[PDB]
Amino acid sequence: KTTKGVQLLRGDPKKAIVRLSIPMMIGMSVQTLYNLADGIWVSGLGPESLAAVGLFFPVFMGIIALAAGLGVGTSSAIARRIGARDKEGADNVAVHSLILSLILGVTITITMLPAIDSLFRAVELAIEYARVLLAGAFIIVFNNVGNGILRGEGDANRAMLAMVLGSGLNIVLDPIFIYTLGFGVVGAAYATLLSMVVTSLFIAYWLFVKRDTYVDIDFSPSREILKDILRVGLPSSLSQLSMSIAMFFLNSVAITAGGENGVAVFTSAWRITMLGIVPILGMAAATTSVTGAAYGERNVEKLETAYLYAIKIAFMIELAVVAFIMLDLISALRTLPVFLVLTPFGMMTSAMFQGIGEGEKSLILTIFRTLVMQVGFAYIFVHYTTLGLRGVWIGIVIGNMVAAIVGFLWGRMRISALKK
Ligand SMILES: CCn1cc(C(=O)O)c(=O)c2cc(Br)c(N3CCNCC3)cc21
């Protein structure tokens, strides 16, 4: 009838925010540690292989964006059916998403793999890197969908295990296929492939075989469900997309402000802050589940409680994290991380927008945060001020301040509108 994850969402919102974020944090931690390590192995492979990276990166990030967004849409739609105590509706979303993962999965493969040979034309290495990655696009999507099912139910521990067993297998298999065996840059993708396959066997085990999930995988092709999944899924894909593009724009700002000296400082600072933003990414994922559950119950008070408690806790964790960092890049490690305490005020709001099904507002807030304020102010402090590399860090921090104020008020505004 019930499950430890579903009994968490339907109960004390303060306990739900905590008990669900912690496993998500550990999962995201290993995930970020992979990105840190995978970038290192690729670095030093030569200039030709790095040129191949920038060839497939816009396509690579396209696949990950579509997959991650769809998973969020799955998570959002399942949490809302759980809150409304709608079992058959919660079962229907899961089956719909798995079919959605199949269609979207094979579509990406059939629409890109034959058309990747012409768009690229270092080039040969990119096509091979594309070939391995595109051939397993359906696997990547299924993973995020199966992840969204668990994350939307409250199975934060089984979802944590997914990415931990996930990223962990890649941290190990990365140097093996890149250096020991000697595939090169393509070995990173082949490590990614082989890793993704193993975990897709573990997810299908829990879902289909073990049946430990709250939902039963009742199915009937409904338009309301399809509208409900894409309403959050589609804008979330553009959110992660613009987030990477912001990293590219900020890079060119670091190019103008300090040069190549220079850009290396920005890459070092962006690495340590990626690990320091994990408690926010881990809690934002938990917030979407709780607020979504609260939205289904039509309990605004509980929704407001969980949204305000997720910020307060994450704010004080960051105060601690900032303290870790405080005690060239050494100068920027004392001014830049101050944007990490402003971040939970904005990331939690967009996450609760996804929770209540309004993904469009989540996309607008994210664009304003990552592009308009972060890149916008950083470009301004570097082109119109005597400050060089230092002004870039100021712009990011001062940009987050504005995006935090707008985000928090917009969040409290819509929470007030949910009563009238
Ligand atoms: C070994 C599977 N895997 C490989 C990766 C890679 O090679 O870059 C991943 O980034 C990855 C990420 C997640 Br989240 C992840 N999870 C969460 C979603 N379900 C599958 C496990 C798995 C990943």
Question: 177: CA distance to ligand 1 center in Å?
Answer: 17
Closest CA to 19 of 184, 154, 129: 154
Mutate to test the pocket of ligand 1, among 177, 196, 198 (most ligand atoms within 8 A of CB): 196
Is the CB of residue 240 below 6 angstroms from any atom belonging to ligand 1? no
- Length of the chain equals 420
Is the CB of residue 196 below 6 angstroms from any atom belonging to ligand 1? yes
Question: 148: CA distance to ligand 1 center in Å?
Answer: 13
Burial class (CB in 10 A: 0-12, 13-18, 19+), 72: buried
SS3 category, 176: helix
Rg (CA), the chain: 21
370 φ, ψ (degrees, to nearest 5): -85, -35
Is the CB of residue 289 below 6 angstroms from any atom belonging to ligand 1? no
In the DSSP assignment, the letter for residue 222 is: -
Q: What is the dihedral of CA 107, 108, 113, 115, to 10 degrees?
A: 90
The H helix count followed by the E strand count for the chain is 18, 0
Cα(3)–Cα(5) distance, rounded to whole angstroms?
A: 5
Residue with tokens 């759980």: 82
Residue type, 214: Y
Which atom of ligand 1 is found nearest the CA of 159? Answer: 17
Closest C-alpha residue for ligand 1 atom 17? 163
Is the CB of residue 287 below 6 angstroms from any atom belonging to ligand 1? no
Is the CB of residue 199 below 6 angstroms from any atom belonging to ligand 1? yes
Question: 121: CA distance to ligand 1 center in Å?
Answer: 29
Question: 192: CA distance to ligand 1 center in Å?
Answer: 8
SS3 category, 83: helix
Give how far Cα 163 sits from Cα of 33, 169, 225, 385, Å: 12, 9, 27, 43
For 50, residues 6+ apart whose C-beta sits below 8 A from its C-beta are 42, 43
Is the CB of residue 366 below 6 angstroms from any atom belonging to ligand 1? no
SS3 letters across 284-312: HHHHHHHHHHHHHCCCHHHHHHHHHHHHH
Is the CB of residue 169 below 6 angstroms from any atom belonging to ligand 1? yes
Contact by Cβ (8 Å): 344, 350: no
Break the chain into its structural domains and give their ranges: 1-420
CA atoms 261, 267, 270, 276: torsion sign: negative
Q: What is the resolution of this structure in A?
A: 2.9
Method of determination?
X-ray
Half-sphere exposure for 369 (CA within 13 Å, toward CB): 30
Which tokens in the block code for residue 275?
A: 């690990």
Is the CB of residue 242 below 6 angstroms from any atom belonging to ligand 1? no
Breaks (C-N over 2.5 A) in the chain follow: 121, 217, 327
